[PDB]
Write a protein that binds this ligand. Structure first.
Ligand SMILES: CO[C@H]1O[C@H](CO[C@H]2O[C@H](CO)[C@@H](O)[C@H](O)[C@@H]2O[C@@H]2O[C@H](CO)[C@@H](O)[C@H](O)[C@H]2NC(C)=O)[C@@H](O[C@@H]2O[C@H](CO)[C@@H](O)[C@H](O)[C@H]2NC(C)=O)[C@H](O[C@H]2O[C@H](CO)[C@@H](O)[C@H](O)[C@@H]2O[C@@H]2O[C@H](CO)[C@@H](O)[C@H](O)[C@H]2NC(C)=O)[C@@H]1O
Ligand SMILES: [Ca+2]
Length: 128
């Protein structure tokens, strides 16, 4: 019950934007054109579902932003739950890196703060 090329997970459909790279704002615009938004992750189940679908050579924007002074906020305004975050060791690390990607390292998948202007792949999400 998800559209062609989207992957279902419980109440949502997920799209892995692999065909091109874009800035955070451009990525959110692409998701928006499909009636979706950059992914908002509320559990390890969701995190692990998403990473199972990703290329280890690529980085993927998610819908998490530093609103100021390391105040992480989801783009759909749902609460940032400190009990379900997946930062890489040593991340987040830099004030001018206000956007977040999922990327892969020797220690596995995780989140890293990066500059919003840096072009990456992304994951879109929409309710079924
Ligand atoms: C060694 O890692 C640290 O430095 C990286 C920058 O390295 C350049 O600058 C240093 C001097 O400061 C120099 O010693 C290096 O040789 C290198 O020089 C540059 O080389 C390139 C050719 O590759 C050349 O074109 C440049 O002219 C030349 N510049 C200079 C000044 O000599 C840094 O990596 C950078 O990260 C930023 C985002 O902050 C990104 O825009 C840059 O593209 C990227 N540059 C390179 C070369 O990779 C490292 O920062 C990483 O890793 C940190 C953890 O150690 C993370 O916290 C950071 O968030 C950042 O993560 C990366 O973010 C990009 C986002 O675009 C993402 O694609 C990657 O997957 C991700 N990597 C990881 C490991 O998460 C770090 O400070
Ligand atoms: Ca970082």
């Amino acid at each position: 019950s998800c559209p062609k090329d989207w992957k279902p997970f419980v109440s949502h459909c997920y799209f892995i934007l692999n065909d091109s790279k874009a800035s955070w704002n451009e990525s959110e615009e692409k998701c928006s054109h499909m009636g979706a938004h950059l992914v908002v992750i509320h559990s390890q189940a969701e995190q692990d579902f998403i990473t199972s679908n990703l290329n280890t050579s690529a980085g993927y924007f998610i819908g998490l932003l530093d609103a100021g002074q390391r105040q992480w906020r989801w783009i759909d305004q749902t609460p940032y739950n400190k009990s379900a975050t997946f930062w890489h060791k040593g991340e987040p690390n830099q004030d001018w890196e206000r956007c977040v990607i999922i990327n892969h390292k020797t220690t596995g998948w995780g989140w890293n703060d990066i500059p919003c202007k840096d072009e990456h792949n992304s994951v879109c999400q929409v309710k079924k």
